[PDB]
Design a protein around this ligand. Sequence first.
Ligand SMILES: CC(C)C[C@H](NC(=O)NCc1cccc(Cl)c1)C(=O)NO
Ligand SMILES: [Mg+2]
Ligand SMILES: [Mg+2]
Ligand SMILES: [Mg+2]
Ligand SMILES: [Zn+2]
Length: 890
Amino acid sequence: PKIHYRKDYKPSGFIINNVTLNINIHDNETIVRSVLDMDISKHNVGEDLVFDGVGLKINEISINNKKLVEGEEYTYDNEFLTIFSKFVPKSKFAFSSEVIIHPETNYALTGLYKSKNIIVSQCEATGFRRITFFIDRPDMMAKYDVTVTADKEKYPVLLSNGDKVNEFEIPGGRHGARFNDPHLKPCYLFAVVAGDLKHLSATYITKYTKKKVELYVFSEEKYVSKLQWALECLKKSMAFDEDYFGLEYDLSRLNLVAVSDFNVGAMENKGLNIFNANSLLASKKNSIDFSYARILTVVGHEYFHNYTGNRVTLRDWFQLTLKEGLTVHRENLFSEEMTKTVTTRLSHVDLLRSVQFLEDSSPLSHPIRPESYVSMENFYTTTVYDKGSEVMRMYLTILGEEYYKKGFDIYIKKNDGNTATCEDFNYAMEQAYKMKKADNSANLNQYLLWFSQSGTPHVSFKYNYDAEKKQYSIHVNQYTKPDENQKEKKPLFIPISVGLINPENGKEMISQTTLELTKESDTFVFNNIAVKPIPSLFRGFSAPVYIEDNLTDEERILLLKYDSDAFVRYNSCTNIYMKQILMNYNEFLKAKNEKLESFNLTPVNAQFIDAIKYLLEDPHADAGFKSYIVSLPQDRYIINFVSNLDTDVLADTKEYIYKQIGDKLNDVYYKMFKSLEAKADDLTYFNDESHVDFDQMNMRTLRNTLLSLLSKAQYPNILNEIIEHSKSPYPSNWLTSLSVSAYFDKYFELYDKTYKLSKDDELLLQEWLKTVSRSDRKDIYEILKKLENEVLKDSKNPNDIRAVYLPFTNNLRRFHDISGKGYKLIAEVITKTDKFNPMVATQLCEPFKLWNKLDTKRQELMLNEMNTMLQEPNISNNLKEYLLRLTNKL
Ligand SMILES: CC(C)C[C@H](NC(=O)NCc1cccc(Cl)c1)C(=O)NO
Ligand SMILES: [Mg+2]
Ligand SMILES: [Mg+2]
Ligand SMILES: [Mg+2]
Ligand SMILES: [Zn+2]
């Protein structure tokens, strides 16, 4: 097996200074002519010249205008072109190749491919070698001169990176355009697009240098009207990087382009950012609310990469978190600032503690900077992205705003125009740390374990209060469970943001402070603490850890009601839920296994239910926050606290708990659903695509969450409220009417009516698919079969495939049916998908990640499907590696 190891990094024996491309697009072939002006590096030892080149049809190969010949001067095996050393010059030389490739048949959406009527590239991580020969690695930085030619009628818009320097006519209906990108870059940042594209545009003027930047956003003609929010989000993104980081854009022009077929969300190609349509295009009549947040965060992310990834790039792929973790951190800061809602941070935490914590206790567990890979693509993980973001955010929590900015500026300045490593970032943050502490002995060496050590720390707490001395102490322990990466886990540098609440009046007793736990355990003592406080721990979720608060439910309710920090309130709520869930889960489990004729369930705490009511009845409390409190923790969060999980028992647990709370609060839920309507569904800004009210959007989420609860409960006459809700002009509302209708005989009429409302917009139809897929229907398998036959059919669009199947995999009762039929269905889809799109196939494996956490029958059923997929002939390297790792074999 071909394993690359982080410690084996060596610079190349060659240098590529300039790339001159001619990309000639025709109906049934694309011809790529390439000149690399190359040199020998000081690390060269007379080795053969080896270029990556995958699936290329060679027309010609030369060095310095001398034709090289197969079997004599080179070999090519469809993956590497080797030029024997004897024929490799000893100093500056021009390597020329011409290859034929076929975007029209590239269903894998990596390299050059056709997405509906657009030709587009995706080069990160190893796609460039599918366009032409290269030493395809991020430390091989060069300048690019790129000409694209095509039929003019079919492809009137031609784009590549950088300044458009010439446009020309060509006989036979063709035309070309030449682009020069003056910044040194790795090949993974090359892009090209050709299409019948429409655009909206604006001019932006940089804050400090006053450079004029032309901003263009592009799509196919049909969706040109759905482009304006993206443009506004780009303007926001640029202003944020200038205002917070001092960072200005560095070309005269920046293009964003939407395409229908894209493996992930978007891509940061210099000057030419390429997006999945679902992360660039929206309109208020034709998109759900979540699209607006998605577009803001993705546009932001791709723009933030212009410094963190582009101007400072990676030495090698093991450094991925340096760009992605740090870009996600910058995106999240931007997103918090733009939205101004406490739910934006909560939603990042929620995603980490569910999806990423699951990954981190699975056999796929890896540190944010991995030690080895086979397929690069398997590293684009929530660990590398989201844990990485939290590691990058802790620097800000530790240093504070002004010292963080100073550290970041040192990082940017030192490494600008060059490659960088995670050590370079920590080194820069270390110089800021030295400054802040006044002290040159202080270092962040210990901080490096956030990059190397895998797994989630557990941070636990014990308290003492001496009421005569007015002295309170917090004793903190950390522990990380040993795993395959490290048999001994070292203590991390853990910042714990804290306050102290007076429990009789709900007020803050201290200035917020950040405890720095650097040992296995430590005791933190506070004086002049006038009464026994309740601690408010890990405010803002200050480190990526399992928190054990050792607080009573009564103390948690008090934080939930009175604490200032939205995370702590929410976490306190979450912990009360989890205690209840683990208690009722155990009771139901013992009932099943011991075959009991009768048994008891512990009821939901009645003071918690009262606190929920109190919060919900507070007209001045945040509506997004309220939607978090009435929903139980996610199943993927729960599963981290249970071994040998019986998923049907968990489903009975959640249902009892919701029913208990419902039986007390349903009238309060109904009353708030009705009284929220006027502000929730107010049409101010409905025709303005430059403006979104994120608070009002949260009112819609709350109303939609309540309706779901009332619907499942069969609250009297809720059906009329579902009917009226289907007539709202907000797609968030009318698609909600479909899924909550699942509990009624009206489902199938709403199905048809929302189908008709959705079917003429590609992205909205994809949302309708997802809504159908996640419907809480007994007959959900027959409904998937209907989606497959009537709507999905043989689509190779990843959005369509993921929309039909992924939401259903989160149906706890059905996906996990004890027959294994859900496991069998998704394995079939994975295997089918892998034959044309290995990346998407592995995304579709995600439900299998928790296999070894289930009850032993469901474990056996999942492993069987996984070993079956591993036996498929011509399984991709991507899927094989993933499944081998996930099944403890690699
Ligand atoms: C371009 C890629 C190499 C990776 C990455 N993009 C990204 O969209 N990750 C999110 C994602 C993942 C899976 C599915 C979907 Cl639908 C979306 C990124 O960082 N862009 O800047
Ligand atoms: Mg080919
Ligand atoms: Mg995000
Ligand atoms: Mg389509
Ligand atoms: Zn990124």
